[PDB]
Paper text:
In this study, we investigated a donor who developed a family of potent HIV bnAbs with different lengths of an insertion in a critical framework region following infection with two founder viruses that were closely related and underwent extensive recombination. The bnAb lineage is defined by a CDRH3 length of 22 amino acids (aa), an IGHV4–34*01/IGHJ6*02 heavy chain (HC) and an IGKV3–20*01/IGKJ2*01 light chain (LC) gene. A greatly reduced ability for donor plasma to neutralize N332A Env-mutated pseudoviruses of different clades identified the V3-glycan bnAb site as the major target for PC39 neutralization breadth. Ab crystal structures show an extended CDRH1 that can help stabilize the CDRH3.
(a) Ribbon representation of PC39-17A with 11aa CDRH1 insertion. HC CDRs are colored (CDRH1 in yellow, CDRH2 in orange, CDRH3 in red) and the 11aa insertion in CDRH1 shown in blue. Structures of all three 11aa-insertion Fabs reveal an extended CDRH1 that provides support to and stabilizes the long 22aa CDRH3 (Kabat numbering) of the lineage. The similarity in backbone conformation (root-mean-square deviation (RMSD) = 0.3Å) and neutralization potency (0.10 vs. 0.09 respectively) of mAbs 17A and 50I suggests that the preconfigured interface in these structures is conserved across 33 months of Ab maturation. However, neutralization breadth was shown to increase during this time highlighting the importance of continued SHM. When compared to other V3-glycan bnAb Fab structures, 11aa-insertion mAb HCs (17A, 23D and 50I) most closely resemble PGT135, which also has an insertion in CDRH1, while the LCs of these mAbs are more similar to that of PCDN-38B, with an RMSD of 0.48 Å (S12(A) Fig). Most mAbs were sensitive to D325 and R327 mutations, yet only those with the 11aa CDRH1 insertion were sensitive to mutation at every position in the 324GDIR327 motif (S4(A) Fig). This difference extended to gp120 binding, with 11aa insertion variants displaying a higher affinity for gp120s as measured by SPR and an absolute dependence on N332 (S4(B) Fig).
Numbering used by the authors:
A (entry chain H): 1 to 31, 31A, 31B, 31C, 31D, 31E, 31F, 31G, ...
B (entry chain L): 0 to 27, 27A, 28 to 95, 95A, 96 to 213
The structure:
Amino acid sequence: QVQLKQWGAGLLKPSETLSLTCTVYGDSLSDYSWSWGVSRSDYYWSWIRQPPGKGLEWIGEINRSGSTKYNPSLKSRVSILIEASKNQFSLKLPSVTAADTAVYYCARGRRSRQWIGELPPGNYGLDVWGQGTPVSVSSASTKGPSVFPLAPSSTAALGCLVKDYFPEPVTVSWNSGALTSGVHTFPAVLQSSGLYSLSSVVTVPSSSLGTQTYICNVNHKPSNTKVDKRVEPK
Amino acid sequence: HEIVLTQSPGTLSLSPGERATLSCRASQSVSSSYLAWYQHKPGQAPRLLISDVYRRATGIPDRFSGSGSGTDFTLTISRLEPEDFAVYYCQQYGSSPPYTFGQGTKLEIKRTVAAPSVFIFPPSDEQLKSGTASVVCLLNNFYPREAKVQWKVDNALQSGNSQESVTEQDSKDSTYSLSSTLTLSKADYEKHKVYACEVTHQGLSSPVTKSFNRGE
């Protein structure tokens, strides 16, 4: 079970230095024995990021020999290092701006031209991925959201406005998870103020608006903010 | 000089059970050893599907296959399953760095046209005490994804003071939902009476307007 543990600070301010690390588990970076499968010298420990609204961008790679390859778009800024004794390799990006806000993935690249016994599927690709570190570059301070009701008007629709929070994400449920049918929790938008905002809506029978209780549960882990907001006809 | 990949189409709309053909073109001819494909679903890391002369990666079922030679490469899904609808990337990996991805193709479910149900929400009294007014317009369960929202304030068309958010395609009925949020200060909001959300969508014969009068 080769897996990648992603860590490092994801909340940064402009002009600061992004510094992420992935720890490899299930294999050794300092093991130079080779008796089966692919040589550990054929692994290329890599970084890939996805900014909001964009595709995957291959950042670069490092071999345990220390040889690096970098994307020319970032070659002037990026540094990738490896520490075999700690099973770690790291990504550094200085002088960050909002354009560096992205989810940053580490991954195992494989490029084998010889092998022993069997060649496992996944050669010439990034076959094992960490699950990412979300990084936000902002001067904003960590802030819990303000939750306002989207009251049903005169099938009915209602919801909650989860406004002015930082950073992402927030978890939203309805009636402590008892209500899921018809719920739409929209992806947050970055407001011009630098804070995020989303709405969560649900369509319900009009007849239930007198009897049923509707409560939206908001959990903003970075600020330890928990809000239960009741939404009722105005 | 480097290897540049271009994928086509940007979006592909197919029904489950159909065959999907995704294209990826390299700027120079590349050995099929170095053409890799990835699947990417929201909330997850990308996953390798095909690499090293069209060999399936671990756990990849047989309906995924690869083909192509020289500059034009193809990912084929012989019979689509509901879990196959996602974004698909090609990557050149091992021929010459940088090992860049293509732009990606969104494979979405094609269904019949569905008109949105439109709802408008005034700002709550509680938010007004904070000095800001948010007016929310909901477009619920529509297809296709393309839709136009036009805010009107006492018949004056707005521009640049609202934001949109669209959900991922619903896993049950394959529709989309969209919210448009108009943001005004408390002082500005109380200067006007009629707040209207005008929605244009191909499932609607004419634009549909939902409105309220401030204070009623």
